[PDB]
């Protein structure tokens, strides 16, 4: 008998065994070399989707720009970016007419957000494309470099600390004739002076790379990293789009998890109830083909212009900057290529900046065609990409556009016997169509498809299907008269997370508990998951039981600790103790779970604030998944690859930054608890605080006049040093 696991679906409905279709136990696919090929493919495809548009040369950067707006109406079902501006404006108008006041109230909330947001909002995130180095940097590091460069060039409006003032500084930098930077090499500092067009090309540039560890995709794809100049504008536009989306029932963003599932189920059931019993109902499990390569920044500018009608001019300008910068964007080509000589047995890296005027004999046929197609667009080492939204940006504004198209499906707008509605999340959608008969269903689907074509939305025919309402798929959630559990999606979360011993134990037990609550993880499987996690935890951290003879480097110390302990159950698993977790106590931290079983001296050593592994007191170092800090809350080593580069002065600079920050925290105790705000310098703020505190201590008699005078003398000395 040949074993056929797929035959299980003959009796178990596919949604009820959907976990079997996710092979998430093996390693995900990765990208090995460069991303230049994928980036060039994306640029060529984006320009191909708009090839019948109008070509212009940008007067400020010189980049050729393709404009598909108001292009010819398509005659086939191929993807295209020929969105009609009047159709988009009419969709926005009807969305506003069906939900009166949505844009006005969203604009009020966004005005409050714009006026109140601080500059350090930009540090939230992993990487930002640093134009001063032509590569990705940590968001805080990129922001610090940009601020230092702006200060050296007399652009100091960001000293207010507000994000909008930083955006004003960006706008002012756009008008500087020359921007100066500083470069390091093999470690001295050199000044480089960009010109206006060079800086403008750098500021409009988004970095590109490949996406690693992506599930369900046979082929790799390119992704983007926004630069420092555009991040604030994108944040403000997305804040407005979020305010709009919060007021829309069809929106799939920004609600996630159980709240999202409940909202979607309620919306679907409301649609079912509003449907007459004497009419057919069909749901479309729909995807869109190349949503971000067909949507145009000019249409987003039009949407923002319609949304911000009757608003103050400054608000309209600050919202409009982002689509304007996105319609003049450049794309970094990437690493380039590597060339291999078989006879001479050598390999070499070809930078992407040489692809403008490199001989085409080296490349193969497909890459040569890519380079030939993209060479007219190449400028200053980047590619001109006017059409398209690059990658994972303006998702909620895309949701707004999709919801407007869905909203166009009321009977007041269709003006016929059919109507539609559904769900929208960025580009993914689900559509419910009602009609007296099948002809009406076909007509409604056709009208939805053609309206989407008008606004530049192409429904992926090969990835969409339609059936009677009751089952659909939306944003990887499988609905079979209700959302079903999908355990395989959370399966990679089980295991040793890799923070430290205490945090990893907490993560393991919390993941088991959360999957019991949410993903229908049964009690027996929860116990087995706990056993497997304990096994992996003991193997990973070399913390097997003391009464075992697993030969590790740590086994002798654990044996010694086990021998001298009286109450073995009190030892943590990190110390070789037993596992006391079961279903009933998954929610309890380990140190608290076995606190009363510990020896007094072992407990005193474990929870000793004067231990070197963690920076009547308690152990404190950012204590995620670590309720009680012990000696097991240590911090692993950082990567040392930067010591071989020219950026190794950043280590000394950050050491001095940490020193100054800790000294400041010595003056403002609440600084760590809540982020301090202020335009004054650190030394000035500290001196003022010291003076007021010394005066108060003298007044209340906590210190004597001699100490007050000494503090005043030291403050005067610091003031003297401050100027010089």
């Amino acid at each position: 008998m040949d074993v056929n696991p797929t035959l299980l679906f003959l009796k178990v409905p596919v949604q009820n065994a959907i976990s079997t279709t996710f092979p998430y136990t093996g390693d995900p696919p990765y990208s090995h070399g460069t991303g230049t090929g994928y980036t060039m493919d994306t640029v060529n495809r984006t320009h191909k989707y708009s090839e019948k548009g109008k070509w212009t040369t940008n007067t400020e950067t010189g980049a050729p720009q393709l404009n598909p707006i108001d292009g010819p109406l398509p005659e086939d079902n191929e993807p295209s970016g020929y969105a009609q501006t009047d159709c988009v404006l009419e969709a926005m108008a009807f969305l506003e007419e069906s939900h009166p006041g949505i844009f006005e109230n969203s604009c009020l909330e966004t005005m409050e957000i714009v006026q109140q947001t601080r500059v350090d909002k930009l540090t939230q995130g992993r990487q930002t494309y640093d134009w001063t180095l032509n590569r990705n940097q940590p968001a805080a590091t990129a922001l610090a470099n940009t601020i230092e460069v702006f200060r050296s060039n007399g652009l100091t409006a960001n000293e207010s600390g507000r994000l909008i003032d930083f955006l004003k500084d960006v706008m002012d930098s756009m008008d500087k004739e020359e921007m100066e930077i500083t470069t390091h090499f093999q470690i001295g500092k050199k000044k480089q002076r960009l010109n206006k067009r060079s800086y403008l090309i750098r500021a409009l540039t988004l970095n590109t790379m490949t996406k690693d560890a992506e599930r369900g995709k046979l082929k790799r794809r390119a992704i983007a990293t926004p630069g420092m100049q555009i991040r604030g504008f994108v944040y403000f536009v997305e804040a407005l789009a979020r305010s709009i989306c919060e007021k829309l029932e069809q929106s799939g963003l920004p609600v996630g998890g159980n709240e999202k599932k409940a909202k979607l189920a309620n919306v679907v059931r409301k649609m079912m109830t509003n449907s007459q019993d004497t009419e057919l109902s069909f749901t479309i499990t729909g995807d869109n083909t190349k949503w971000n390569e067909n949507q145009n920044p000019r249409m987003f500018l039009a949407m923002i212009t319609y949304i911000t009608r009757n608003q103050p001019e400054w608000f309209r300008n600050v919202l409009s900057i982002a689509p304007i910068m996105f319609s003049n964007k450049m794309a970094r080509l990437g690493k380039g290529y590597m060339f291999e000589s078989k006879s001479m047995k050598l390999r070499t890296q070809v930078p992407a900046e040489m692809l403008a005027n490199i001989d085409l004999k080296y490349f193969n046929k497909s890459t040569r065609e890519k380079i030939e197609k993209i060479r007219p667009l190449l400028i200053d080492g980047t590619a001109s990409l006017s059409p398209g939204m690059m990658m994972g940006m303006f998702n909620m504004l895309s949701t707004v556009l999709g919801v407007s198209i869905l909203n166009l499906g009321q009977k007041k707008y269709t003006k016929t016997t059919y109507w539609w509605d559904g769900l929208q999340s960025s580009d993914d959608f689900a559509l419910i169509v009602n009609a007296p008969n099948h002809e009406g269903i076909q007509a409604g689907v056709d009208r939805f498809y053609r309206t989407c074509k008008l606004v530049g939305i192409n429904m992926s025919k090969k990835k969409s299907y339609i059936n009677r309402t009751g089952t659909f798929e939306f944003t990887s959630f499988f609905y079979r008269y209700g959302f079903v559990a999908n355990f395989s999606m959370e399966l990679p979360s089980f295991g040793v997370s890799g923070i430290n011993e205490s945090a990893d134990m907490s993560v393991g037990v919390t993941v088991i508990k959360n999957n019991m609550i949410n993903n229908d993880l049964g009690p027996a499987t929860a116990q087995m998951a706990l056993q497997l996690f304990i096994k992996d935890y003991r193997y990973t951290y070399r913390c097997h039981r003391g009464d075992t003879q697993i030969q590790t480097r740590r086994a002798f110390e654990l044996k010694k600790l086990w021998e001298q302990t009286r109450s073995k159950a009190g030892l943590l698993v990190s110390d070789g103790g037993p596992n006391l977790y079961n279903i009933r106590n998954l929610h309890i931290p380990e140190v608290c779970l076995k606190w009363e079983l510990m020896d007094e001296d072992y407990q005193g050593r474990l929870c000793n604030p004067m231990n070197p592994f963690v920076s009547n007191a308690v152990v404190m170092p950012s204590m995620e998944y670590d309720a009680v800090a012990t000696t097991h809350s240590w911090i692993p080593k950082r990567n040392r690859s930067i010591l071989n580069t020219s950026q190794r002065g950043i280590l000394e600079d950050e050491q001095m930054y940490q020193k100054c920050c800790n000294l400041f925290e010595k003056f403002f105790p609440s600084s760590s608890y809540r982020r301090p705000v202020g335009i004054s310098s650190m030394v000035e703020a500290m001196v003022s605080r010291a003076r007021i505190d010394a005066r108060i201590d003298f007044e209340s008699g906590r210190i004597k006049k001699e100490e007050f005078a000494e503090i005043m003398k030291i403050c005067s000395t610091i003031e003297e040093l401050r100027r010089q």
Partner: protein, 729 residues
């Protein structure tokens, strides 16, 4: 002194002086997050890779003096190599496990105080009581539940301001504590933490764990309080329920809320029984709320609620015929009402349904800071006489009275983005939303309410829209002044009459809202779902029909009258709209009778779907039904008579009946099932013969079949986009 000396030291060095001068306080956060780049992408892989290294762990440079370089076996515990970007050194995990057995020992006596929440969890689990495990048809519902209760009358921002005031008095900025709750908690924690010897940051984190509320959406069954949410993995499953009571002390407001929920469920279920009083009594004696018998709670709980008072009166207890509305205790001195749903258009152009109380009534309002006498008619305030304490108390009383009056002016006074659905599209109580909106800013409400001259009666003062004591003109029908349980008898139909003989309460006065309990409500009887939510009621009713299909089918064939009178259908009948119960019952009984007289037209699924609707006393009308409505969380969910439905879909491939998305069980094919496509339980007086037949002209609708006569075959658009041939017997 040490701080200023260290600052003077840093200002002497060139680079530190540059950092201290050129960096503002706003940019201090940016330089604090400043880093060379922690190249962490796959932390699990990185940890597995680093644990194979000699020294994967960093430690402060004091370890070279606090821990020896080598242990007894000579294994190295630390190295002098410094970590990147710091002066910390590289150490082995052997150093940590050596410290845990040889390091200096300190006194860990303050740890239970600092981490009181986790040890509180430990104590609650330690003293908890486990009951039996019941395998049931669980119906979980995604709802917002609290995982960290925090403090009752506080929000996250208010709690943070209180914490800043308590721990960092000189860093509060411009905030001034206004709410009396904030002042009380601040004084209490300042006194409790006076002369405390813990680090201020740790104290702030303790107060955050103690005072900051946190709520999340979870698929929850049973109680939604924090003590039950923290053990939700333990107590609730997909097919089982574990009876459990936390060992701590239960908050009394949770008890009040759960008692209200249970009383409402019990009263609504009892209203449809033959003898409501006996059913209510036997249900109250079988109900537990958080491990406590319901009767004991009723005997020791002073909760002002209609269903709670009906439950009390049924047991001979004295009741106070009162209720709560917007923080005030209302009591109807005289008058009567009948509820009526009326659709209204809000000021911000929103359409919503409001339960409108008809009739003229008089009330007395009692609050912690104000008192009023209220007289009203249908959506019209006759007069209001407030005698509050200060300006804000009288303002709040006036706002509450205006919202209670359901005045169309109040509805049209709504401005801004006032939402009447949840963030998860769950319908909210309109009155509560209006209260919360007008308690934030009521200038527009007072402006649009109107004005009225006063006649200077008894010296009672007038009130102006900007809250001033005028003596000439006042708000329309508003006047300003200056500053008990009763034995009852309850009828067989739960009608509560005072000793004189006047009616005080009735089942119709019980709210139709279907809420959820803070504390798990355990019901012990044959049907453990008898007082459960509508989804569980529907699923369990159809599963009960499925499991008992043999004898139910036999009874339906032989003695339908006793089958229709089963007590199991009564929780279902509590969901059918009251006005339509008789019509649905009569229609379904006629369908069943036709199904019996037409042999071979025996559709098992049709009988199972339509049986629970026949449990009501039948009313005979000629109206046809294509669908029957069932109230589920306020929205009438239709069950389509022919074909599948959102509530009731039967899958012929799996033979598995699914209700509201919950599996209810698998049917088995009867030998007498009609494998001929002939239907007799779809139209009240018409028998479906087959598919479309063009010979008999165009298709018509179900609602126009009266003109047809005996044997007149016709085509009807019955069902979802289908046309079939029907004939009249």
């Amino acid at each position: 002194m040490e701080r200023i000396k260290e600052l003077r030291d840093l200002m002497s060095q060139s680079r530190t002086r540059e950092i201290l001068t050129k960096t503002t306080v706003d940019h201090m956060a940016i330089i604090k997050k400043y880093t060379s780049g922690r190249q962490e992408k796959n932390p699990a892989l990185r940890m597995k890779w680093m644990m194979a290294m000699k020294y994967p762990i960093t430690a402060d440079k004091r370890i070279m003096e606090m821990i020896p370089e080598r242990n007894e076996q000579g294994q190295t515990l630390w190295s002098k190599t410094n970590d990147a970007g710091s002066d910390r050194v590289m150490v082995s995990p052997l150093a940590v496990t050596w410290w845990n057995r040889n390091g200096p020992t300190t006194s860990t006596v303050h740890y239970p105080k600092v981490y009181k929440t986790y040890f509180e969890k430990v104590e609650r689990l330690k003293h908890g009581t486990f009951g039996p495990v019941h395998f049931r048809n669980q119906v979980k519902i995604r709802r917002r539940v609290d995982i960290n209760p925090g403090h009752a009358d506080l929000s996250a921002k208010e709690a943070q301001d209180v914490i800043m005031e308590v721990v960092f008095p000189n860093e509060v900025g411009a905030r001034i504590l206004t709410s009396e709750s904030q002042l009380t908690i601040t004084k209490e924690k300042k006194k409790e933490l006076q002369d405390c010897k813990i680090a201020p940051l740790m104290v702030a984190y303790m107060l955050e764990r103690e005072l900051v509320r946190k709520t999340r959406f979870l698929p929850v069954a049973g109680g939604t309080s924090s003590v039950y949410i923290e053990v939700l993995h333990l107590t609730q499953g997909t097919c089982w329920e574990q009876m459990y009571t936390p060992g701590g002390e239960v908050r009394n407001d949770d008890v009040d809320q759960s008692l209200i929920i249970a009383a409402r469920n019990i009263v609504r279920r009892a209203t449809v029984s033959a003898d409501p009083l006996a059913s209510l009594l036997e249900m109250c004696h079988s109900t537990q709320i958080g491990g406590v018998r319901m009767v004991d709670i009723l005997r020791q709980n002073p909760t002002e609620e209609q269903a709670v008072d009906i439950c009390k009166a049924a047991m001979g207890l004295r009741i106070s015929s009162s209720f709560s509305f917007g923080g005030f205790t209302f009591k109807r001195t005289s008058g009567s009402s009948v509820k009526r749903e009326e659709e209204v258009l809000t000021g911000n152009l929103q359409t919503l349904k409001i339960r409108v109380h008809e009739g003229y009534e008089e009330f007395t309002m009692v609050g912690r800071r104000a008192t009023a006498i209220l007289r009203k008619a249908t959506r019209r305030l006759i007069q209001l006489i407030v005698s509050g304490k200060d300006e804000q108390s009288i303002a709040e009383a006036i706002i509450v009275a205006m919202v209670f009056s359901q005045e169309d002016c109040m509805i049209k006074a709504v401005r801004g983005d006032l939402n009447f659905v949840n963030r998860a599209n769950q319908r909210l109580n309109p009155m509560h939303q209006l209260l919360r909106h007008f308690q934030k800013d009521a200038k527009v409400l007072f402006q649009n309410w109107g004005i009225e001259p006063i006649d200077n009666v008894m010296g009672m003062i007038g009130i102006l829209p900007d809250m001033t004591p005028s003596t000439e003109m006042s708000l329309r029908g508003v006047r300003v002044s200056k500053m008990e349980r009763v034995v009852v008898s309850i009828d067989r139909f739960l009608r509560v009459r005072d000793q004189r003989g006047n009616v005080l309460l009735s089942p119709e006065e019980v709210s139709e809202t279907q809420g959820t309990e803070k504390l798990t409500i355990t019901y012990s009887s044959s049907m453990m779902w008898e007082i459960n939510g509508p989804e569980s009621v529907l699923v369990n009713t159809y599963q009960w029909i499925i499991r008992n299909w043999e004898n139910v089918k036999i009874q339906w064939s032989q003695d339908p009258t006793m089958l229709y009178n089963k007590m199991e259908f009564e929780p279902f009948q509590s969901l059918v709209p009251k006005a339509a119960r008789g019509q649905y019952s009569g229609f379904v009984r006629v369908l069943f009778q036709q199904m019996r007289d037409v042999l071979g037209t025996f559709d098992t699924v049709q009988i199972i779907k339509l049986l629970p609707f026949a449990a009501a006393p039948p009313e005979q009308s000629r109206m046809q039904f294509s669908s029957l409505t069932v109230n589920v969380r306020g929205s009438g969910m239709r069950i389509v008579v022919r074909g599948n439905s959102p509530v009731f879909n039967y899958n012929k491939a799996t033979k598995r009946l699914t209700v509201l998305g919950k599996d209810a069980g698998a049917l088995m094919e009867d030998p007498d099932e009609g494998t001929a496509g002939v239907e007799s339980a779809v139209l009240r007086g018409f028998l479906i013969l087959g598919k479309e037949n063009k010979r008999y002209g165009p298709a018509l609708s179900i609602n126009e079949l009266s003109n047809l006569a005996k044997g007149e075959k016709a085509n009807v658009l019955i069902g979802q986009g289908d046309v079939v041939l029907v004939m009249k017997r």
